[PDB]
Amino acid sequence: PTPILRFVAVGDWGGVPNAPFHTAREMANAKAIATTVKTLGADFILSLGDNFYFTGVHDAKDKRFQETFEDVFSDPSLRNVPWHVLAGNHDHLGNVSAQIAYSKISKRWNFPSPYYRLRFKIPRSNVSVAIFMLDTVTLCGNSDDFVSQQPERPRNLALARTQLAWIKKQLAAAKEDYVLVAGHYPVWSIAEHGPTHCLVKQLLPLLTTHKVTAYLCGHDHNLQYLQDENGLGFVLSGAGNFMDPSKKHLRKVPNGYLRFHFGAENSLGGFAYVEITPKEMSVTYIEASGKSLFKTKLPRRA
Numbered sequence: 455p456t457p458i459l460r461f462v463a464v465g466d467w468g469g470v471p472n473a474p475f476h477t478a479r480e481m482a483n484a485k486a487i488a489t490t491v492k493t494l495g496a497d498f499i500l501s502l503g504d505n506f507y508f509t510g511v512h513d514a515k516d517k518r519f520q521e522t523f524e525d526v527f528s529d530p531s532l533r534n535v536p537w538h539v540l541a542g543n544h545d546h547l548g549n550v551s552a553q554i555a556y557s558k559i560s561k562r563w564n565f566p567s568p569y570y571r572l573r574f575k576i577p578r579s580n581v582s583v584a585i586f587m588l589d590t591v592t593l594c595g596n597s598d599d600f601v602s603q604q605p606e607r608p609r610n611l612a613l614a615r616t617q618l619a620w621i622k623k624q625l626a627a628a629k630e631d632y633v634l635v636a637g638h639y640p641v642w643s644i645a646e647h648g649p650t651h652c653l654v655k656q657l658l659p660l661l662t663t664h665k666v667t668a669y670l671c672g673h674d675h676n677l678q679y680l681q682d683e684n685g686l687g688f689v690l691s692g693a694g695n696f697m698d699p700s701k702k703h704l705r706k707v708p709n710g711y712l713r714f715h716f717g718a719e720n721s722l723g724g725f726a727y728v729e730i731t732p733k734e735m736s737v738t739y740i741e742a743s744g745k746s747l748f749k750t751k752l753p754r755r756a
């Protein structure tokens with residue numbers, strides 16, 4: 455066969471704080487992710503943040519971990535698939551240290567620190583993949599701290615500077631055949647929040663300079679694929695719980711960058727399915743109904 459690494463990227467799936475602690479959308483995506491894993495396989499699942507609506511969890515023993523996560527994603531095919539997690543703005547209104555500590559309670563939950571590096575070998579090959587999981591809230595500010603619901607400035611300047619220095623160092627030294635970067639906030643998005651100026655200003659030049667394959671995010675509650683004139687990809691998968699049809703920020707993205715968008719208000723949402731082989735990275739957007747909406751490939755760089 456062809457060596458392949460496969461994973462699901464889902465964002466903004468965090469249910470609700472009132473009973474039954476999930477939405478119809480979250481359950482449809484849990485069912486649809488289970489079908490994809492059953493039929494096509496997943497080595498892991500990437501959460502793009504906003505893991506517990508609307509104010510996160512209060513400590514590692516918070517019931518929401520079982521009510522909104524464990525019990526929800528409980529279908530047989532999903533039961534032992536590892537999750538690699540980062541935080542969104544609603545998580546940061548609550549206790550993010552609790553979500554990190556929860557890694558030692560639940561085997562499949564992996565969240566060792568606010569930001570960190572993942573390394574993978576495509577099985578049966580020497581081809582390698584690095585994913586850098588970012589905390590865009592501590593870097594840019596918590597959008598929910600502001601009436602604008604934009605991340606206007608970071609809560610702690612040292613922590614922000616420290617993370618940016620780490621990204622810069624890691625991206626310059628990364629030797630892997632594929633490099634992905636993931637964060638809750640978008641770089642580009644046509645939808646209700648739109649582009650994050652903090653990330654456009656500070657992260658995007660690093661993605662370009664160091665030849666990153668793609669940036670993955672959620673935060674806007676819809677599905678988008680964007681690509682710039684250099685081939686850098688932007689996978690936005692933020693439709694695990696909510697579907698916002700907004701195109702408020704369409705004119706804030708450079709012309710031609712938007713290659714796909716799905717935001718239908720009546721849809722149950724969806725997620726992204728990533729396949730990386732020694733020849734290409736493929737991304738398939740899958741609606742909670744099971745249907746494939748869009749597929750695109752990003753070539754390997756030598």
Ligand SMILES: *[C@@H]1O[C@H](CO)[C@@H](O[C@@H]2O[C@H](CO)[C@@H](O)[C@H](O)[C@H]2NC(C)=O)[C@H](O)[C@H]1NC(C)=O
Pocket residue numbers: 512513514515549551552555
């Ligand atoms: C955030 O969550 C962490 C982790 O659950 C809490 O840390 C716990 O705090 C109390 C004692 O201070 C005990 O339950 C444990 O000894 C602590 N666990 C760890 C891993 O440190 C922390 O108190 C929470 N913070 C807030 C503000 O709620």
Ligand SMILES: *[C@@H]1O[C@H](CO)[C@@H](O)[C@H](O)[C@H]1NC(C)=O
Pocket residue numbers: 579580
């Ligand atoms: C990596 O593995 C591929 C397998 O096709 C091989 O072509 C290449 O020589 C290897 N690179 C090395 C050994 O540096």
Ligand SMILES: CNCc1nn(C)c2ccccc12
Pocket residue numbers: 599600601602
């Ligand atoms: C903790 N700081 C919050 C804050 N600062 N500023 C200037 C604001 C303006 C509008 C809404 C919220 C804020």
Ligand SMILES: CNCc1nn(C)c2ccccc12
Pocket residue numbers: 602604648702703704705706
């Ligand atoms: C397409 N809308 C661009 C825009 N202009 N302004 C003043 C904003 C304030 C908050 C969020 C977005 C915007």
Ligand SMILES: CNCc1nn(C)c2ccccc12
Pocket residue numbers: 699715716717718719
């Ligand atoms: C329905 N929300 C996403 C969406 N907007 N538009 C104008 C589309 C056209 C074709 C396929 C999908 C879409």
Ligand SMILES: [Cl-]
Pocket residue numbers: 604605649650651652
């Ligand atoms: Cl912004």
Ligand SMILES: [Fe+3]
Pocket residue numbers: 466504542673674675
């Ligand atoms: Fe969200």
Ligand SMILES: [Fe+3]
Pocket residue numbers: 504542543544638673674
């Ligand atoms: Fe968010």
Ligand code: NA
Pocket residue numbers: 545546547548549550
């Ligand atoms: Na917090």
